[PDB]
């Protein structure tokens, strides 16, 4: 059995950038439903004795879809924080300047990739096995965990992530995503 | 250049099953954006001057995604009507009973397929090349027009189609879809 992890902050702590109503549906109903559905699909199978990550790397179909979405959304909630956002500092800023020229060029490329990701999906900042950073987009429950790249930052662009607050304006959601980025989490992901 | 076809009913005519606000966004912003983006992508290319169906059957990528979504939503708006819904009669009722056993069995199988269609997509009633009817689900902009099957009815299950009115309850959206089905349009397509 897998449980829904506690949210790292109060449900209105990301406002006005993501509302408390988007958190009650996205965390309290959508992320809860993926945990329940995962638990029901793996009951009595060999997947019951594996870690979530090992399930994601060895499954397909419905088991994959629910396990990758449990992981992807727990990672997503940790990428956001109250009294954060702004430009990064330290090793993160150096790593971004080195692979993308500057933070302003990285922000522009990530935003563009997130806006253009057609349908439901995720856009990721990853560190490839060679140490360079790159922006990749996945469709639906797709995740960098099935490749050699290490996930550092993600934004959910399934319409449920923003439709209550921004309706069709996915660019407005992305502009406000930058005010919430938890660069401390990204730093821990880069150093691991 | 393509035009956004007018809705065949007023923007509040599907209320309360689909609200006037959902039509304002889904038709007025989302479907309009696909026409503008399609016009922009084909200007000055060999696709300019072909019909929408010819473009859908010969393209891939962004041209395909935008062209298929323009056609798919015009077909969807035509599948819905005020003062309709209920059980089909005539030739449509006979073809549905012959392929699914009964209207109740078809409605149950089409609802299950639309709810389980993971991510953004569409669920379709189609007439196959051998005359039998079948339910098929597509992902993102996918449409039976690229196959040999004739589309008869569709439901949009991208989250924007229902999130304003039903939030995450896609079952509730499908229950209300049945109250809007314009069986005269389905009869027109069954005969084509
Ligand atoms: Fe999500
Ligand atoms: Fe739509």
From Swiss-Prot, chains A, B:
SUPFAM superfamilies noted in UniProt: Fe,Mn superoxide dismutase (SOD), C-terminal domain, Fe,Mn superoxide dismutase (SOD), N-terminal domain
Assigned keywords, A-Z: Acetylation, Iron, Metal-binding, Oxidoreductase
EC number: 1.15.1.1
Superkingdom as given in the UniProt entry: Bacteria
Residues that bind Fe cation: 26, 73, 156, 160
KW Acetylation (keyword) present: yes
Cofactor: Fe cation
Residues the record lists as N6-acetyllysine modifications: 50
NCBIfam families to which the protein is assigned, alphabetical: PRK10543.1
Its biological purpose: Destroys superoxide anion radicals which are normally produced within the cells and which are toxic to biological systems.
Name this polypeptide is given: Superoxide dismutase [Fe]
Species in which this protein is naturally found: Escherichia coli O157:H7
Lineage: Bacteria, Pseudomonadati, Pseudomonadota, Gammaproteobacteria, Enterobacterales
